[PDB]
């Protein structure tokens, strides 16, 4: 909107957490934002703290897996006071219509490798918790709105996360039947989980790097950079609208 | 010789994974506890020997235990963490009710072998996670004075309950683990990342085999109690 007198309108600094798993998922994010970054070490992570328009952005890569990503997200929330968290990186596709480089937002997430079935618990379920973790409706709808306005496809679906790289037809088919998941990665569920426990709105974005079959290693290696960029670009376009 | 040791305000974090693992701890300390909720956990804050003690159960598995430990450290400033609870035995010499402290821990369900990494390993990390040589030495001294046995060994942690011969054998061959549970590794990991001395203490509840579910169910209370008593006696000496 037009602001004739800028002093009449709110200028308070909104704090946003931006997470990737690997350095390569955040390099494109650092560049696209294109501002100066103070680097703050904590809990074995490097937090990149910068100012971008009305917003304090805190950018880090967690390192791979649930423990890493759980710790980092908890640090963003508790040590940097972030009020929103946006995750960007790559994932493996489990569905034919999600192709290499395609984007998706997780409506729900599950830890696919959790197994308490010995006490009759469904796979993915833990007492005092739930199978499916929710994300922010606000941010997910924002996501669909920018996708539609920029004329780019955006799937929304269930993301499965676990502490294994998936690269076989059998594990894929398990994730589809057990969870109706559209993609697979190693941090999503944990990040969304933490945010839900602290009441912090969370959006999980992923660009497809492979198909989670026996070729996945090679496909992941080939498409990491591009898929990372494609996710980072879309995340920035979300932050610009925030 | 107090004057020679640390003189400031001590704060000690005390963790179980399940409520049943901390109920006996709370009871043993006997002091009054302020309940403080944060990030879906309830932290029980009390004073004993003029140290603050912060007790919580994390809920089950890596994500839960990682969050809770990080909250303890970042929100409550705990300077050491002692974990108490139960675990499945992977070795003949560890039988029901027996105590062990973890010398090292491993996350046994981590698998990046598709990129030729050894099982348990993640880039920019390590297969094995260390614990506090001093806290463990304290546990061992206390054990010998109370004339109770205390093994030292590797504890394997993963987000599955282990109840099969096959997985047992994998844990022994791949990591030379002595016991299995679902939180120890993640707790020790966070403490390591933050430079916080950690001791992981477990009392055996089952043999991690096809009978494990039933054994765990029967022996949870007593094994948790045994662990909790021992943790208390460690805190007594801090
Ligand atoms: C040693 C290097 C490892 C690559 C890390 C893969 N990331 C991890 O979060 C995401 C991911 C992309 N494709 C995947 C797949 N098929 N399974 C699991 N995770 C993924
Ligand atoms: C409803 C499910 C309750 C099991 C909770 C398991 N606790 C660690 O959370 C300890 C444990 C004891 N024995 C075990 C075994 N064989 N495998 C994994 N973990 C363990
Ligand atoms: Zn019974």
Which CATH number belongs to the domain containing residue B116 in this structure?
Answer: 3.40.50.1580
CA–CA gap between residue B171 and residue B235 (Å, rounded): 31
At B65 the three-state DSSP class reads helix
Tokens of A221: 């290696």
At B61 the three-state DSSP class reads coil
Ligand closest to the CA atom of residue B211: 2
Whole-Å CA distances, A46 to A20, A31, A62, A72, B35: 12, 16, 9, 10, 33
CA–CA gap between residue A56 and residue B90 (Å, rounded): 49
Beta strand A55-61 with A14-20: parallel, antiparallel or unpaired? parallel
CA–CA gap between residue A144 and residue A136 (Å, rounded): 12
Centre a 10 Å sphere on the Cβ of residue B237 and count the other Cβ atoms it contains: 11
Beta strand A155-161 with A202-210: parallel, antiparallel or unpaired? unpaired
Centre a 10 Å sphere on the Cβ of residue B77 and count the other Cβ atoms it contains: 12
Contact A126 B60 (CB under 8 A): yes
Residues of A in contact with B113 (CB under 8 A): 165
CA–CA gap between residue A171 and residue A192 (Å, rounded): 23
Which atom of ligand 2 has the smallest separation from the CA of B88? 13
Label each residue of chain A as H, E or C: CCCCCHHHCCCCCEEEEEEECCHHHHHHHHHHHCCCCEEEEECCEEEEEEEECCEEEEEEECCCCHHHHHHHHHHHHHHHCCCEEEEEEEEEECCCCCCCCCEEEEEEEEECCCECHHHCCCCCCCCCCCCCEECCHHHHHHHHHHHHHHCCCCEEEEEEECCECCCCHHHHHHHHHHHCEEEEECCHHHHHHHHHHHCCCEEEEEEEEECCCCCHHHHHHHHHHHHHHHHHHHHHHHHHCC
CA A67–ligand 2 middle distance (angstroms): 18
Best mutation target among B159, B207, B208 (most A Cβ atoms within 10 Å) is: B159
Cβ contact B157:B62 at 8 Å: yes
At B56 the three-state DSSP class reads strand
CA–CA gap between residue B61 and residue B53 (Å, rounded): 23
Range of the domain at A198: 1-242
Tokens of B12: 């000690």
**Nearest protein Cα to ligand 1, atom 14:** A92
Best mutation target among B16, B20, B63, B121 (most A Cβ atoms within 10 Å) is: B63
CA B158–ligand 2 middle distance (angstroms): 9
Selecting among A6, A24, A25, A56, the annotated active-site residue is: A25
Q: B149 vs chain A: nearest CA distance in angstroms? A: 30
CA–CA gap between residue B139 and residue B145 (Å, rounded): 10
Decide: A188 in ligand 1 pocket, CB within 6 A.
no
Tokens 């709808």 appear where?
A141
Residue B46 annotated in ligand binding? no
CA–CA gap between residue B208 and residue A134 (Å, rounded): 33
Q: For chain B, say whether A165 makes contact (Cβ under 8 Å).
A: yes
Please, which residues have CB within 8 angstroms of residue B193's CB and are 6 or more apart in sequence?
A43, A44, A71
CA–CA gap between residue B107 and residue B31 (Å, rounded): 35
CA–CA gap between residue A128 and residue B67 (Å, rounded): 15
CA–CA gap between residue B236 and residue B12 (Å, rounded): 12
CA–CA gap between residue A174 and residue A180 (Å, rounded): 9
What Rg, from alpha-carbon coordinates, does chain B have?
Answer: 17
Phi, psi angle pair for B71, to nearest 5°: -55, -45
CA–CA gap between residue B115 and residue A221 (Å, rounded): 10
Contact A70 B67 (CB under 8 A): yes
**Nearest protein Cα to ligand 2, atom 4:** B161
CA–CA gap between residue A129 and residue A119 (Å, rounded): 15
**Nearest by Cα to A193 from A77, A55, A20:** A77
CA–CA gap between residue A98 and residue A182 (Å, rounded): 8
CA–CA gap between residue B160 and residue B184 (Å, rounded): 13
Beta strand A38-42 with A103-111: parallel, antiparallel or unpaired? unpaired
Cβ contact B68:B101 at 8 Å: no
At B82 the three-state DSSP class reads strand
Q: Is A25 a catalytic residue?
A: yes
**Nearest by Cα to B16 from B147, B181, B150, B141:** B181
Tokens of B94: 């560890």
CA B25, B30, B35, B36 torsion-angle sign? negative
Q: Report which DSSP code applies to B49.
A: T
Decide: A216 in ligand 1 pocket, CB within 6 A.
yes
Q: B109 vs chain A: nearest CA distance in angstroms? A: 7
The residues facing A123 across adjacent strands are: none
Decide: A21 in ligand 1 pocket, CB within 6 A.
yes
Contact A43 B75 (CB under 8 A): no
Please, which residues have CB within 8 angstroms of residue B125's CB and are 6 or more apart in sequence?
A63, A68
Cβ contact B130:B196 at 8 Å: no
Q: For chain A, say whether B210 makes contact (Cβ under 8 Å).
A: no
Q: For chain A, say whether B71 makes contact (Cβ under 8 Å).
A: yes
Residues of B in contact with A127 (CB under 8 A): 59-60
Considering all CA atoms of chain B, what is the largest pairwise distance in Å, rounded to the nearest integer?
Answer: 55
Q: For chain A, say whether B60 makes contact (Cβ under 8 Å).
A: yes
**Nearest by Cα to B218 from B101, B96, B99, B61:** B96
Which atom of ligand 1 has the smallest separation from the CA of B122? 1
Domain count, chain A: 1
Show which of residues 123-162 on chain B sit within 8 Å of chain A, judged by CB atoms.
123-125, 159-161
Locate the DSSP E strands across B5-150. 10-16, 34-38, 41-48, 51-57, 80-89, 99-107, 129-130
Q: For chain A, say whether B37 makes contact (Cβ under 8 Å).
A: no
CA–CA gap between residue B155 and residue B204 (Å, rounded): 12
Calculate the CA dihedral of residues B85, B193, A61, A33 and round it to 10 degrees: 130
Phi, psi angle pair for A56, to nearest 5°: -90, 110
Best mutation target among A65, A71, A113, A130 (most B Cβ atoms within 10 Å) is: A71
Cβ contact A157:A182 at 8 Å: yes
Experimental method: X-ray
Cβ contact A238:A18 at 8 Å: no
Residue A187 annotated in ligand binding? yes
Phi, psi angle pair for B79, to nearest 5°: -100, -15
CA–CA gap between residue B105 and residue B153 (Å, rounded): 9
Burial code (b: 16+ CB inside 10 Å, e: under 16) for B105-130 equals bbbbbbbbebeeeebbbbeebebbbe
Residues of A in contact with B194 (CB under 8 A): 43
Selecting among A102, A156, A185, A210, the annotated active-site residue is: A210
**A187: Cα within 13 Å, side-chain hemisphere:** 28
CA–CA gap between residue A125 and residue A121 (Å, rounded): 6
CA–CA gap between residue A166 and residue A172 (Å, rounded): 7
Phi, psi angle pair for B46, to nearest 5°: -145, 180
Please, which residues have CB within 8 angstroms of residue A187's CB and are 6 or more apart in sequence?
A19, A21, A62, A64, A65, A66, A68, A69, A87, A89, A161
Cβ contact A185:A89 at 8 Å: yes
Tokens 């709370």 appear where?
B26
Helices B62-76, B184-193: inter-axial angle, 10-degree rounding: 30
Cβ contact A208:A90 at 8 Å: yes
């Amino acid at each position: 909107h037009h602001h004739h007198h800028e002093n009449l309108y709110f200028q308070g600094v909104q704090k946003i957490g931006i997470l990737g798993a690997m350095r390569e998922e955040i390099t494109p994010i650092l560049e696209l934002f294109g501002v100066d970054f103070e680097e703050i070490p904590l809990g074995g992570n490097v937090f990149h703290k910068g100012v971008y328009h009305n917003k304090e952005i805190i950018v880090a890569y967690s390192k791979i897996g649930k423990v890493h990503s759980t710790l980092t997200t908890t640090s963003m929330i508790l040590a940097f006071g972030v009020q929103k968290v946006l995750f960007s990186g790559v994932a493996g596709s489990l569905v034919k219509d999600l192709k290499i480089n395609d984007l998706l937002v997780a409506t729900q997430l599950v830890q696919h490798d959790v197994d308490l079935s010995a006490f009759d618990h469904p796979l993915g379920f833990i007492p005092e918790s739930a199978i499916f973790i929710e994300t922010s409706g606000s941010l997910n709808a924002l996501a669909k709105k920018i996708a539609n306005e920029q004329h780019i496809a955006l799937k929304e679906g269930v993301i499965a996360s676990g502490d294994q790289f998936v690269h076989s037809k059998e594990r894929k088919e398990f994730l589809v039947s057990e969870f109706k998941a559209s993609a697979v990665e190693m941090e999503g569920a944990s990040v969304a989980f933490v945010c839900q426990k602290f009441g912090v709105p969370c959006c999980v974005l992923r660009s497809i790097s492979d198909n989670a079959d026996e070729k996945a290693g090679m496909s992941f290696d080939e498409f990491l950079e591009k898929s990372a960029h494609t996710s980072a670009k879309f995340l920035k376009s979300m932050v610009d609208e925030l």
